Amino acid sequence: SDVPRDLEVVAATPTSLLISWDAPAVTVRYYRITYGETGGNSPVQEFTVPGSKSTATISGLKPGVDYTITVYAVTGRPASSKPISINYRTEIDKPSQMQVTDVQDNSISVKWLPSSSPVTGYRVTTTPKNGPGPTKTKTAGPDQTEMTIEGLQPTVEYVVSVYAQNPSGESQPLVQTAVTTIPAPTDLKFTQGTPTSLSAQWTPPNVQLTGYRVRVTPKEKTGPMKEINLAPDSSSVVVSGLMVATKYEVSVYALKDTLTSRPAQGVVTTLE
Secondary structure, eight states: OOSOEEEEEEEEOSSOEEEEEEOOSSOOSEEEEEEEETTOOSOOEEEEEETTOOEEEEOSOOTTOEEEEEEEEEOOOOOOOOOEEEEEEOOOOOOEEEEEEEEOSSOEEEEEEOOSSOOSEEEEEEEESSSOOOOEEEEEOTTOOEEEEOSOOTTOEEEEEEEEEOTTOOOOOEEEEEEOOOOOOEEEEEEEEOSSOEEEEEEOOSSOOSEEEEEEEESSSOSOOEEEEEOSSOSEEEEOSOOTTOEEEEEEEEEETTEEOOOEEEEEEOOO
């Protein structure tokens, strides 16, 4: 007969549905594709496509809602067909605007806005953007909005994807990248002190650096303080021009271009 046959949706999107039907043998002038929400009194929308084309994309919809789509075949110059109709639900919406709230050498913390759809939970994946590493997966409850992914590697750009979970399908991921910082220098050991000098050695972190920054400040007394920039191939420092009988805090920051380590700190007093 003249009714279209085997109407189905072939691709579902939070905002769009792609439908297709069987092209009839004798040519049709044009089709009438009405669509509206299943059980909603808001006005139905409708558009036409030429008889040559056997597919249609319905755009500008809402996510996670059931739609009824109806197709008519027009032949006159008019004369309409019997309606063929299907119902389908759009894909649930994704969370939005993710924030990175904390970045360390082995973890990244993120916060996101909840999806608008009803959600049963979240699935969060973390994988390196370029280096072919493993994909870590963590699950969050429906009312959760923040997560910390531990077990990461230093100065690695990670891709963090958040998926909203729902029985009627899972959302598309909310995606954000972040770079972990560098480990701190280990075992800041003070080796020697003189009236005006200070000598400190440390263990370097386990990633290649661009240099070090050392700063020494008196804790309770006041006077000039010192900052020193070191080469990456440094395991010790000697800071001169200090004051006698002074409590000096010493901190060493590892540097990798824009990446700054958390300090290895200690305090020591100069000789009498």
